[PDB]
């Protein structure tokens, strides 16, 4: 039983937005589908529930008229739709199976960032060895997130991608450090793969002394 | 919103209790009270349902109680892994549902750990673009409070400093970052720059030089 949610979304206030939730592994018309919102640093907020047998919905009054929950019984899909987004809608949204009184199965969550600021792609610089610690500075990007891999996924040990800093410019910086034997520095290539989906940025930098 | 304490703490082996006070349209009109555990970067996991019922994947250390419009979640043999956020849910009149504000459970026995500081100077690729940035990476510290100070030749640097709030790692220790943005001329003028990290009264310094 999986509830697969749609990808992350970077939008601007006033734009429409539809996020989806595909259910699989059970009889869809027999369980309710609920939507739960959680802001960054905040708590869980119930938004509404829908019965996919007859599309009957119930909403939290604070969200009624601002968002719409809908169902597609032919495709086992649940939809959450905004006609006009607000910056206060920036949050993570989970779809979840609701059975009588509990919430048993959750989705992975869809991150929705609503900002009038511009998507900016990062600048990648190598933090060179001077055990040794190599790294990569990911500088000036919006919005979050950035993902950093080393060696196309082969270097997973010693990898610490430190958390990002929101700078005064309104942009973010991040640093990823891999600790390596100081004897491989001359015999082993170390490449940082920086991926920033909001800007469609994908860069690879080789870190050399 | 159901009312929960903002924070609750305890020691390993001890038994802690989290309250959840609602009205009679939620906790006091139904026996449908659910308890959820959420770890950072994870979705919530059902811990207790129907007031006292417990699912099969939950240790018997987790019990539920209801007393009027107040519900209660008890955790008996405290482990470090129990440190998370705990949310109560209730079924409300009109086929609605309601969540609580959240309780941060803290396990109060973790051992003091000193921070490791790694300081990276600006890269040539960045100085070529007429930019300079020094990077201080602070790792493996507990508790999660640090002070960062930058010095150029011993003199306190005032501007260009951007520091993160401490954040928990996989080892239950804390990590932080400090970035000092400089122009290439400032970077090439001073003999040395230092990042000083103060934690629990002790200061650890790292230095770089062009």
What kind of sheet is the major sheet of chain A?
7 strands, mixed
Instruction: Tell me, briefly, the overall form of chain A.
Output: elongated
How many domain regions of chain B? 2
Briefly note the CATH topology name of the largest domain in chain A: Immunoglobulin-like
Total DSSP helices of chain A? 0
| Assigned CATH superfamily of the largest domain in chain A | Immunoglobulins
Q: Approximately how much beta-strand content do the residues of chain A carry?
A: over 45%
Number of strands of chain B: 18
Helix content of chain A: under 10%
Question: So, CATH architecture of the largest domain in chain B?
Answer: Sandwich
Strand content of chain B: over 45%
CATH superfamily of the largest domain in chain B: Immunoglobulins
CATH class group of the largest domain in chain A: Mainly Beta
Structural class of chain B: mainly beta
Q: What oligomeric state best describes the polypeptide chains here? A: heterodimer
PDB class: immune system
Keywords: TCR mimic antibody (Fab fragment), immune system
Assembly: dimeric
Entry title: TCR mimic antibody (Fab fragment)
